[PDB]
């Protein structure tokens, strides 16, 4: 858990995914916030079948190999780091 420890602050948001365009999948856990939260921070979210121009992608990249194959742990480590960390 981390989320509960991080999002424990209403949505916390910080300059994590700062400009980080990661494709947040709907199948991803905590998506609810993950989405609003992420894009909220100041980044952007592209729909799986919509990334071509995207920048980041949660779990896989296919839809957009030009994006970043980050995970749920990245968001936390990122948001918490206040600076986009190693996407993976």
Swiss-Prot record:
Q: What is the effect of changing residue 78 to Y?
A: In MTDPS20; severely decreased protein levels
Signal peptide residues are none
Q: Which residues form the BRCT domain?
A: 12-88
Tissue and organ expression note: Testis, thymus, prostate and heart.
Q: What's the subunit arrangement here?
A: Isoform 3 interacts (via BRCT domain) with the nuclear DNA-repair protein XRCC1. Interacts with POLG. Interacts with POLB.
What pathology is it implicated in?
A: Mitochondrial DNA depletion syndrome 20, MNGIE type: An autosomal recessive mitochondrial disorder characterized by severe gut dysmotility, muscle weakness and atrophy, neurological abnormalities including epilepsy, migraine, stroke-like episodes, learning difficulties or cognitive decline, and neurogenic bladder. Brain imaging usually shows diffuse leukoencephalopathy and may show cerebellar atrophy. Disease onset can range from infancy to the teenage years.
- What is the role of this chain? Isoform 3 functions as a heterodimer with DNA-repair protein XRCC1 in the nucleus and can correct defective DNA strand-break repair and sister chromatid exchange following treatment with ionizing radiation and alkylating agents. Isoform 1 is targeted to mitochondria, where it functions as a DNA ligase in mitochondrial base-excision DNA repair.
Swiss-Prot/TrEMBL domain comment:
The PARP-type zinc finger is required for DNA ligase activity.
The UniProt family comment states: Belongs to the ATP-dependent DNA ligase family.
What's this protein's name?
DNA ligase 3
Q: Which residues of the full protein are shown?
A: 922 to 1009 of 1009
């Amino acid at each position: 858990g981390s989320a509960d420890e991080t999002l424990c602050q209403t949505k916390v948001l910080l300059d994590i995914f700062t400009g980080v365009r990661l494709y947040l999948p709907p199948s991803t856990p905590d998506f609810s916030r993950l989405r609003r939260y992420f894009v909220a921070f100041d980044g952007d979210l592209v729909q799986e079948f919509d990334m071509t121009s995207a920048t980041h992608v949660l779990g896989s990249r296919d839809k957009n190999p030009a994006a970043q194959q980050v995970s749920p742990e990245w968001i936390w480590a990122c948001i918490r780091k206040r600076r986009l960390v190693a996407p993976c």
